[PDB]
């Protein structure tokens, strides 16, 4: 299980106190091989009425609706994946779908418009890399926590625009800092080589966030 592996990876790095290093050698912990294929580039919280809309870095759009269904529009602009409450995955198109799915598709297009016109694409400088959906999300005062169906957990921090993408299959983390510089690390190498105070702080917070996901299944 991805989240459990992630909790272990984060305990291990954090128990090592990586910032309390005489000689921090954070560069030697980079692993460009573990760069994620997918992360969330943009999002819009319309959850008080409809759901949470988001764009992945491949330009695909998705919505986790309030009724616990999910609609994914692929980056071709017409292919859909729909996920009913019982988890049934199906392939459809905007051009050919059930009539009952019109309100949802209309909503997705509205959200996609807002996101396309007004929001910045996180990680737009990065060349990445099956298509994950948003399993669950929540917000704190500090951050939004997005858990994708491929096991990845992304945590975006509001105040300083820093972000973590935690990749349990690679035991890795990608950190996008205040400068929009994107660096991908193997967590066990952060244990050996150490890291800056700011990243160690975000990793401590990340473990609390994975605790919250594991405790709210």
């Amino acid at each position: 299980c991805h989240l459990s592996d992630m909790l272990q990876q984060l305990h291990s790095v954090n128990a090592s106190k990586p910032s309390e290093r005489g000689l921090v050698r954070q560069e030697e912990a980079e692993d460009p091989a573990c760069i994620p294929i997918f992360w969330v580039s943009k999002w819009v919280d319309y959850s008080d009425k409809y759901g949470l809309g988001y764009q992945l870095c491949d330009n695909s759009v998705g919505v986790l609706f309030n009724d616990s269904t999910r609609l994914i529009l692929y980056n071709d602009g017409d292919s859909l994946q729909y996920i009913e409450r019982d988890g049934t995955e199906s392939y459809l198109t905007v051009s050919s779908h059930p009539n009952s799915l019109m309100k949802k598709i209309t909503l997705l297009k509205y959200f996609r418009n807002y996101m396309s016109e007004h929001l910045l694409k996180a990680g737009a400088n990065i060349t990445p890399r099956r298509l994950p959906y948003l399993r669950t999300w929540f917000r704190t005062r500090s951050a939004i926590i997005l858990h994708l169906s491929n096991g990845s957990v992304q945590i975006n921090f509001f105040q300083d625009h820093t972000k973590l993408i935690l990749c349990p299959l690679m035991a890795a983390v990608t950190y996008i800092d205040e400068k929009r510089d994107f660096r991908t690390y193997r967590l066990s190498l952060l244990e050996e080589y150490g890291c800056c105070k700011e990243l160690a702080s975000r990793l401590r917070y990340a473990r609390t966030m994975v605790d919250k996901l594991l405790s709210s299944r």
Binding site: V44, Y46, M115, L119, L120, F158
Partner: peptide
């Protein structure tokens, strides 16, 4: 309290 990602 942002209701969307970075503009």
């Amino acid at each position: 309290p942002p209701l969307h990602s970075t503009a």
